[PDB]
Amino acid sequence: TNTKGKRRGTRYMFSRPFRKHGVVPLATYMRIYKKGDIVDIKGMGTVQKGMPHKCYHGKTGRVYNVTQHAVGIVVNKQVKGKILAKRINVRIEHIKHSKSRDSFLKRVKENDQKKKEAKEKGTWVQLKRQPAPPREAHFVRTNGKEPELLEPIPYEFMA
Amino acid sequence: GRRPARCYRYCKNKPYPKSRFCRGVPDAKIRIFDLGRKKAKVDEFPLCGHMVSDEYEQLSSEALEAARICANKYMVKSCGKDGFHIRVRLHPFHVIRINKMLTGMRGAFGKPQGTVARVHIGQVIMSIRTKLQNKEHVVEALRRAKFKFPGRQKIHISKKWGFTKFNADEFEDMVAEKRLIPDGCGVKYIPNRGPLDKWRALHS
Amino acid sequence: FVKVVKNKAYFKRYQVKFRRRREGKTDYYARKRLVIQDKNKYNTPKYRMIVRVTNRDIICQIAYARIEGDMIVCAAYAHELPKYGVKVGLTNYAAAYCTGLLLARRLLNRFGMDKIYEGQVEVTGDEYNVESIDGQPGAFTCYLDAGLARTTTGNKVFGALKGAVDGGLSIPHSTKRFPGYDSESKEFNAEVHRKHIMGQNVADYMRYLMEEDEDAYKKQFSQYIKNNVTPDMMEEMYKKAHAAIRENPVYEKKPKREVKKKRWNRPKMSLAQKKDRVAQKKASFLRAQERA
Amino acid sequence: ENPMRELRIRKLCLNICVGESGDRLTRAAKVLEQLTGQTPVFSKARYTVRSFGIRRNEKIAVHCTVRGAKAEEILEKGLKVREYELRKNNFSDTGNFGFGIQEHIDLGIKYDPSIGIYGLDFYVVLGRPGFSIADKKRRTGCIGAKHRISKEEAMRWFQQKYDGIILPG
RNA sequence: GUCUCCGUAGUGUAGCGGUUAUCACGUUCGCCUAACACGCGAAAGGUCCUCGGUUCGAAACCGGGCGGAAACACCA
RNA sequence: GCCCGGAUAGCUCAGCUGUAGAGCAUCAGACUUUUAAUCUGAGGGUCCAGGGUUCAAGUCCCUGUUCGGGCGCCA
RNA sequence: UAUCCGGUAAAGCGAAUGAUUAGAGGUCUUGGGGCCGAAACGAUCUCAACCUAUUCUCAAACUUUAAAUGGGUAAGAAGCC
RNA sequence: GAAACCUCCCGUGGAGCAGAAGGGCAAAAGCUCGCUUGAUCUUGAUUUUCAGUACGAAUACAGACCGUGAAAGCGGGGCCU
RNA sequence: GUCUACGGCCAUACCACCCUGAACGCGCCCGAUCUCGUCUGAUCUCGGAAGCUAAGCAGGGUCGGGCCUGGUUAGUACUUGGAUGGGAGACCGCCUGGGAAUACCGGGUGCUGUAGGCUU
Ligand SMILES: [Mg+2]
Ligand SMILES: [Mg+2]
Ligand SMILES: [Mg+2]
Ligand SMILES: [Mg+2]
Ligand SMILES: [Mg+2]
Ligand SMILES: [Mg+2]
Ligand SMILES: [Mg+2]
Ligand SMILES: [Mg+2]
Ligand SMILES: [Mg+2]
Ligand SMILES: [Mg+2]
Ligand SMILES: [Mg+2]
Ligand SMILES: [Mg+2]
Ligand SMILES: [Mg+2]
């Protein structure tokens, strides 16, 4: 049976990628996490203080606390057959804003624009998303040149 | 002295090479991978034939040796002492364990028996180079070697010039153009990325 | 010969250092500690009092740090000090004070805390700092940013700090590094500082030289002797400048125009030109070797 | 008609590696102090060697960098002792050079049956104006290329400045 | 195979991380003897089994190599 | 854990708060043809470590480290 | 549909670590053995390790690369203003 | 003298960081100095094993009192497991 | 056109050698009285402004290495799901969808924020 040590099997997990070792580039720190902000956790070798546990790497969650240089950050964790929402304090370095949400918001803002407009006009526009549809009828013009034949080609043993 | 090659034929395990970990590995049979006139230039031997496998199997080091020998011996007796060059092309690296029996199955992870190759379907085993006179000898050299291996291998007599990575129809042409340049048993490919001082060594 | 050290291999696996580390400018260890904020403060600034001395100049700026690039609210250089009264010896401690003070007043007029937060008008040199007023807007607080200076005692940086402090910025410090502070005793003369602040340590040098040797004094203090600036005209002069700076700091720039727009520099050579050159070079090689 | 590629002397490094410790060492330091007019600095051992009889961190040698005029003059002396002959091998590829004097009384000092005769060893470090960018703190860098002092270039300097010979072999 | 221990001048052995590696015998060279022995004075001689490590430093401490020796191998 | 005991020159041991004893061992003189044996001198003690009491401690005091003899034994 | 995570198959080893064949080129270093040399980086070979470009074949406890399948969020009234 | 000490040049780290390995680390997390006891006093929260109980281990805060530094800050034991 | 100070992203910015640098800068530079620190004013600290772009620095150059980004490699290797497919096994072919990495060959070789200069 295995060892229950904390870092076990994070040889390539907490490992600063090829030619990105060394100093934690400042932006990282000087960017701001509020309550309600959604964040994807991702460990980082260099900063060890406040390193999140290996189960929560890649896992993504919401920020419920903000201390001087850390964030309490609710995440989900499937334990056998009963997912636990649970709350982990992570230092900023092992944390990024998730963009998952940004694209939704972008689309909300676009709807509220297209709702204000096209109200005075009268025409109700399709706001909802709609799945990638069947690819329509259309012509293919083969101008002049007829389509090229493709013979399957003989076998010959290369090596 | 040693187990029969039935039992260590198939690629059953991950490769287990003579490392930090697998140590005490007794040496391979095969040491000498190339023989003939290995001091021959590319121009004076163009005609590889490449015994090429068709299983996904392990060939014993002991087998390789025998095959190589059986091929060399036939090449000499046929064409001449120095009329060719051979190149064995499967070094045994996989170490192959052996739980010996004087307990039972209790803690039975083997000591190392020996070394062995791993050959993919279409990997070359042995390739010979010699003259355009010689090809019929070459094949029979390889034919006879085949019997010293398990599985199946197909002798094939193969487009490149020499041992090189270049197509033999183009090879005669290239050399004058000086894209290719002689360099022992091989040939160096000089390409126009160059600093021009390199270009000025040639053409002069 | 030896094994070549810097092979392809070397360069392949080789990581550059940060650009300003490469230049030899930013100390990123400190930068981090200095500059970034607590998160529970959130967006709110953390200001610096950058102070950098250059061979002939003293630059003093105030900056917080946004993710895009740390921003200068307000800056005053040494070479502005002519307007006010300082004509030479502008990289020196006294000028640093002037600069640093200048920077303070300038910054305190922008927020309109000019009339409030005078600070220290008399130039004692003593431990001083600004108690923020109640029923009033608080004092501006930036932390000193020393760069790569060995921050011993006497380091001009702490002059410009002093200056700013006396100008009315709440910068924390200790006096352990102002000129004066006696290492092997551990107190502070303050008057010793004042002297340095006013240029007497320069003035005294001047006097000691003229006594000793004319030719040395003339070589050392040419632009000082030119402009007619003596040891006994000196303390006054600085005090006048502080008075000018204190009374009207605001900057005006110069209305720059009438630019011809000629390329001093040399532009990058287009692919085809480069592709040409080798053609020519090969042809040239060929024609040369086809003679002898 | 160059401006400031004025091949000068950066430092003259002297040292006396007695490799004993105790008296002979502090007795040698008196030789450098006399010579140079500045307290020298001891250098302790890297690591223990039974073959030489030196322990790790045992003060083995005493040495002294001298710059400016006093370095020049002491270089002058040393060369007088070596009668202005050096060898090609005494000039390093990097542009510097050295030599040893076999005994310090030949310079200009008086023997004492106590303070015996320390042999010592000069090494001249040639420079050029603007060679400080190496070793300053803030905007460090190399020192270009055409600025570095060639083995050739030093030899001719020495040949020129001190009338030296630079014998072959 | 398991577990154990031991590998040091020619021989048998001491050796407490800083030694000129100890003791005895043997060897060589003087004397003593007519000769030899005994005896006396001198001297020479260790790849510290091998390789790697730790250590400022290993003959020893730690690991693996080649040698060598005891105890176990029982219940059907 | 409780009592007690020894630690001193290479070794074994004396030592009553004011050159540390004895014997052997170690080295130089006699003796010996020479060696041994023996007689004479000579050298050699961090008195196990630290702190105290004391004008002054190898000793008196405590505290440790050992070392052994006996007792003793609830997480 | 957006958006992170990952270091497995594969691949790579003219990229790091390790492993490994061969010839070209190198008094690099120096040697141990030679042959022709009193001896000589003299001439000539050689085998040792090191180096310059090349080349043969490898990795469960190597890796620049790097999939498929796979795991997180998000897709509104607890939201927008 | 292959090894002593001195000097210059090259050096992405091939060293060092008590120990196994793996991660991490260069105006440092290495070395050297200077001062020091945050290896102190105390509420709860959380992670890790988890049953999502303990122990141990750790992560954020909060209040005391201090160290250090010009300061920003950093420190309530050992770069992390 | 371009610099300085503080920067973000961190090689399209690195390395090597070569040329070119107006004005402002930034430099080297010349000193040791004070401040401060050294075996040494070399570094550090301070006071300067006689020289000079030699160097740093900047811009460019190089059928340059490196890095960057395309193509090729290859619908190759692999791989999700499927079959009373094949094959003595080893393995392979198919269906269904997903799809790499070298060698090789091209192109690229810093962008940019705040504040303040010069070219008036
Ligand atoms: Mg059988
Ligand atoms: Mg198996
Ligand atoms: Mg600092
Ligand atoms: Mg794995
Ligand atoms: Mg694989
Ligand atoms: Mg530090
Ligand atoms: Mg606290
Ligand atoms: Mg530490
Ligand atoms: Mg100077
Ligand atoms: Mg220049
Ligand atoms: Mg130039
Ligand atoms: Mg290129
Ligand atoms: Mg079925």
mmCIF file of C-alpha atoms (C1' of nucleotides) and ligand atoms in Angstrom, chain I residues 21 53 55-57, ligand 10:
data_model
loop_
_atom_site.group_PDB
_atom_site.id
_atom_site.type_symbol
_atom_site.label_atom_id
_atom_site.label_comp_id
_atom_site.label_asym_id
_atom_site.label_seq_id
_atom_site.Cartn_x
_atom_site.Cartn_y
_atom_site.Cartn_z
ATOM 1 C "C1'" G I 21 25.721 56.482 -33.115
ATOM 2 C "C1'" U I 53 32.304 57.253 -27.240
ATOM 3 C "C1'" A I 55 33.817 50.011 -23.549
ATOM 4 C "C1'" G I 56 28.684 49.701 -21.307
ATOM 5 C "C1'" C I 57 24.262 51.325 -23.701
HETATM 6 MG MG MG J 10 29.697 53.274 -26.584
#
